Amino acid sequence: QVQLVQSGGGVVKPGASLRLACSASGFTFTDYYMSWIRQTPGKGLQWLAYITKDGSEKKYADSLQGRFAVSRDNANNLVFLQLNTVEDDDTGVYYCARDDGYYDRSGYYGVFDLWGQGIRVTVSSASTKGPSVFPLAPSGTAALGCLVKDYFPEPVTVSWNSGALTSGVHTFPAVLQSSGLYSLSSVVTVPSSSLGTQTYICNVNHKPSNTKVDKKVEPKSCGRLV
Amino acid sequence: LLTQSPDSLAVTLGETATITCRSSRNILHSLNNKNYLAWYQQRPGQAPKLLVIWASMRVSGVADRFSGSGSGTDFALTISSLQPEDAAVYYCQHYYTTHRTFGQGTRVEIRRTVAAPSVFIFPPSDEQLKSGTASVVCLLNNFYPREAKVQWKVDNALQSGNSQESVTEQDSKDSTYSLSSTLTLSKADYEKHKVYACEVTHQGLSSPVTKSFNRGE
Ligand SMILES: OC[C@H]1O[C@H](O)[C@H](O)[C@@H](O)[C@@H]1O
């Protein structure tokens, strides 16, 4: 019932602008300050901004140098954060949060008692690109997998045998390569006795590039026959 | 400035975890005897969740096994009877001023008995080699603890700067980790050498384990 649903964000080129939004339900929106908080590798968890109940007063982290701007539309239960002149240090996960607190002569004091799901913001010049999918061919337990290489932006999803195979699967977090493209592998361990009789197919979906690949992973053949 | 310690803690299910938060400036207000400190829990892939306010007051819904304590500049969160869902990163946060800040986080993981990795090596596929690149993948599967060293040797020369690693989150059921290490070379460089090996060191292994192949076999 009570929740914050975030949208927007995604990829943004260096120096460009990006809008984030947050939709509130299940509580009286105009009774609360709202804040934005991000999580980045270099700066950890960082409060960015708050905005008062009626939207007339805003406060920002000075380290942002005025580059961010918060607003709210109380009639529609929305709060917004606009990022400007984005820089690489702005890459991270951004959260809207309900800000539960009080005001006195000295300022505003509060905790964050309800949070949105988070939106990833990726500052990068890279062009959208679908992955190449390569088999990691097997060989009483065998390992096999798929290498999902050279895509942008995150995320990719990997399933095995259309979701029929989940036990023993490990899909690794993507790593960013020096090219600005991501790579990951997905592996699964299975009985050696199943190789050759059971089919193994990794299903890779990269929605940003409209890419869908189904790659059969077969045991490597050593003869002249095949 | 809020400094948490330790940076990470491994706790056996059912046992007690204690996380510390030290503030660079007093956050006890003399006039109301309150400490302006909150604690949050962040499970993997989720937003932080508020657990404690005023250093020791659990918020509605939070079970007694989460206990906040401390005063002035030294605070602690104690988790008794640790449960699987308590594996998370925990953060403190002060609200003594209008510029709120968080500690850097303490990661709490589930402790278990050492498990050695099963180690697998994959040559590049012929498909990839056609495109002009060679990725060699070393897999370390289902090990504990997380700490492991993986070294690539190509015709017995230690490699540096041409591999990247990735590690899974702790497995929900067996509490192990898996790790991939990927060596990336040009097709030309790959074909200059015969023996490709990944050497794995892990507390669960008496001596390093090497998995290798000869190119073309
Ligand atoms: O092993 C724990 C780690 O798992 C994965 O690498 C996650 O991406 C990372 O956030 C987490 O710290």
Numbering used by the authors:
A (entry chain H): 1 to 52, 52A, 53 to 82, 82A, 82B, 82C, 83 to 100, 100A, ...
B (entry chain L): 3 to 27, 27A, 27B, 27C, 27D, 27E, 27F, 28 to 213
From the paper:
The principal target of these antibodies is the primary immunodominant region (PID) on the gp41 fusion protein. The PID is an amphipathic 15-amino-acid region that separates the two heptad-repeat domains found in the post-fusion conformation of gp41. Cluster I anti-gp41 antibodies, including patient-derived 3D6, 7B2, and F240, bind to the HIV-1 PID region (HXB2 isolate residues: 596–610).
Comparison of the PID-bound and unbound structures of 3D6 and F240 revealed that the two Fab fragments have different mechanisms of binding. For F240, no appreciable conformational differences were detected in any of the CDR loops in the heavy or light chains between bound and unbound conformations.
